């Protein structure tokens, strides 16, 4: 469907630029030119957790995790975890293209030689 986002930017603390010690996470203060988080900005329940590709992401550590997305190919998309070694990433890619599952992050820690 047509994904509505309701808020493109981020929600930052008041005076977060004014000091380097102050973080940028949302912390409630305890003018109105600051966008404050609230439940009205909560996205549509169908559209929630959707990539710009239109899938829901799913972290995959190994091939047995990849096989759990066998039936739900058009709905989900596999994302390789950040700490997977490069021997296993090519096996995961070959298995996923065999399964026909869209990998969100191919070409991670990998190159194509000859």
């Amino acid at each position: 469907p047509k994904i509505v986002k309701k808020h493109t930017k981020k929600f930052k603390r008041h005076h977060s630029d004014r000091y380097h010690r102050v973080a940028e996470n949302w912390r409630k203060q305890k003018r109105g030119n600051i966008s404050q988080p609230k439940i009205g900005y909560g996205s549509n329940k169908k559209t929630k957790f959707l990539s710009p590709s239109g899938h829901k992401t799913f972290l995959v550590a190994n091939v047995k995790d990849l096989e759990t997305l066998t039936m739900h190919t058009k709905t989900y998309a596999a994302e390789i975890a950040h700490n997977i070694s490069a021997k296993n990433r090519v096996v995961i890619l070959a298995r996923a293209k065999a399964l026909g599952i869209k990998v969100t992050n191919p070409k991670g820690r990998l190159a194509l030689e000859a």
Binding site: K48, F49, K56, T57, F58, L59, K64, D65, T68, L69, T70, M71, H72, T73, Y76, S85, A86, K87, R89, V90, L93, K97, A98, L99, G100, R109, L110, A111, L112, E113, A114
Partner: protein, 190 residues
């Protein structure tokens, strides 16, 4: 006991169950037809069960009866599916006669998916692969960068170029008054 087993599996630890970022759950149960871990889905929570599943080449229908709740080695019954797609769906509807709609529907779906996966694997086996993947070790990459820097700094290539050009020039190889060299400068060489 099945609903007790189900509420143990649901409200406490199903070891096969995987939690998505969305909130949805996924059994890694090898017999589970859908990927999900729901009430109909867990093969552990249901004693009548069925599953399309492939052993090395051939696809088998796996049947689970409450009659064999004990003896889990003799639990699964195996049926060889036909290579005819229509005939094998007919075989599914035969062996799941007087059976519920969920198992027949998802079982046909899993069969179609596995057959199409077989088709794509045959395609990729026949597909030509020029490039192959290489992950590069950072140790190797750092040695490559630093040793290329050490080679370029070590070999002053420009001076050696000047050397070999003077070598070709004084050796001959350009004739008398070449177009490369000015005549006065060449006479200074001569």
């Amino acid at each position: 006991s099945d609903e007790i087993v189900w509420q143990v599996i649901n409200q406490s630890f199903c070891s096969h169950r995987i939690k998505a970022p969305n909130g949805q759950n996924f059994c890694r149960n090898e017999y589970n037809v859908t990927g999900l871990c729901t009430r109909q889905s867990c093969p552990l929570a249901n004693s009548k069960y069925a599953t399309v599943k492939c052993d090395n080449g051939k696809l088998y229908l796996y049947m689970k009866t409450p009659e064999r709740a004990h003896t889990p080695a003799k639990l699964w019954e195996r049926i060889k599916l036909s290579k005819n797609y229509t005939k094998a769906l007919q075989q599914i509807d035969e062996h799941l006669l007087h059976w519920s709609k969920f198992f027949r529907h998802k079982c046909k779906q899993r069969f179609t998916k596995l057959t199409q996966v077989m088709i794509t694997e045959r395609r990729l086996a026949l597909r030509e692969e020029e490039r192959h993947y290489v992950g590069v070790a950072p140790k190797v990459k750092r040695r490559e960068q630093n040793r290329e820097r050490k080679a370029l700094v070590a070999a002053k290539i420009e001076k050696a170029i000047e050397k070999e050009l003077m070598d070709r020039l004084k050796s001959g190889a350009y004739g008398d008054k070449p177009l490369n060299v000015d005549e006065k400068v060449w006479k200074k060489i001569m």
